[PDB]
């Protein structure tokens, strides 16, 4: 019993992780098969406009010291994919799990390995409705990853940078942002957030396994306009599918858990799940694999 | 920038988690060297297990212990305290550097959550003043570990038990924290907060810029306690105040005027205000862990 905010093991992903040095700049690096990838701005020097194109080409092989650990590794080919370099080495990285890219969607979640100068220092567990991950990264984490597991690693994010707001900002593993930002030191403006209906749900029903049911007690479209007003992602019909099973194993239908929850924004001392807040990082996958224990 | 509740990684733990079967029962075990340790009640078919003349009847291949896929071989068994010690003729190659340590009330500690000898994922625990521990255990999970990592992994706690619905354990030497013990039968302390990590989370707050707490009064280590008792709140010691040191001086906040900050937020509440994202004082982060995470302390 109990409900905590978990993430997956990650020695999978620490064998991956390197010390990626070009110039001064050194961040971390993701070590698969035979390629090294990191964020492109490791060849950033005052360069608030970088033109990487230009960048890279003053750029050679030599130039990219790669550490696997005490072990140096070395670069004989680079390339530019979207917002990534790719730096192909010699050597194929024998502790390579099986592993797959893949782009999330908002509101999924995932565990970040922080990294600095390529060593691990903890791991966590939401990308948000506007793109953003509130997670804890110092400056040198750039290049630390976030991840999925099924044997398989499915790496979804790679950090590339700490916004002025203090919230962050990355890529997948094609180098294409999440959400409008660009890896440039300025200014830049992410959405309105929204609190991710769905998840609330799922904790809603993950307190309901655990005991906690003091807020049970509406429709789609009723609820839609009271989730608005809070500022709510609205909840479709695909949210409704995907918390059935959940519905199915506590018996309480999905349309009765959002009138839980519209009763609980219209009216607010008590706790859920030991939180005097309404969590949205737990997706229905995540209470499911917690509370029936899926291993790896 | 942000604050994280964040475990440590958690490989060379995961390279150690074996299974452990007796009869009826799987658990976990924490293979080290050419020994598996894992929870004692392995053995029960419970309510009142007498558990030294239900070892009598267990032989070395009564158990299997599986390392993965391997089947390794069992050629010494014994019952240390709570736990039991499985000599196995084949070193763990995976075995860190390691230790066993007791840990302290209101510690932390990372839980590596495991079934059949897998793991499922890991979190930050503190050790509740209470002994218990406010985890996250399905049936199965008995024999993971808590541990904190320095190269070196030192293990500080094995799941024993969901009490009827907080979790309780031993160190690897089996000795319970608390006053447990290994029967389904019990009676927890009474729960405090943990003043001096709600004291360094403050700390973290004001370094991540949540800075409208900070209050224009101070107060004395006995005038704080005081106040303390009346709100359930652990005793603030000495002690307690040279470890608030480093983030005292960091923040250039005095630990006492911290101290009345967090006196007018257990007297006034925090009306409906958040704190580093939380609408409740946090109590599971350590002054260590406050500043590992802020400077960014690696393994
Ligand atoms: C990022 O975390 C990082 N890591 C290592 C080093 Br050395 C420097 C880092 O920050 C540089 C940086 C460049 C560009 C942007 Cl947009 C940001 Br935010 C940070
Ligand atoms: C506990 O994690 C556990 N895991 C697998 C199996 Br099979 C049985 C387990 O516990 C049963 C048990 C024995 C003794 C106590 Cl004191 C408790 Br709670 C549970």
Known sequence: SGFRKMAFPSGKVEGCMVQVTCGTTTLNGLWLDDVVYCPRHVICTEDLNPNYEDLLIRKSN?????????????????????????????????????????????????????????????????????????????????????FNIDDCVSFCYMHHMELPTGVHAGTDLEGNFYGPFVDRQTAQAAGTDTTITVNVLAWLYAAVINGDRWFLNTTLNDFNLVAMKYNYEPLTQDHVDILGPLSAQTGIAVLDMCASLKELLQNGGRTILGSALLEDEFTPFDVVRQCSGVTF
């Open 62 to 146: 030599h130039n990219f010291l790669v550490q696997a650990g005490n072990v140096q590794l070395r670069v004989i080919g680079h390339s530019m994919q979207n917002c990534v370099l790719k730096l192909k080495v010699d050597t194929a990285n024998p502790k390579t799990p099986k592993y797959k890219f893949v782009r999330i969607q908002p509101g999924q979640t995932f565990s970040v390995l922080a990294c600095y100068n390529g060593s691990p220092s903890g791991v966590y567990q939401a990308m948000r409705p506007n793109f953003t991950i509130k997670g804890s990264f110092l400056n040198g984490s750039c290049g630390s990853v976030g």
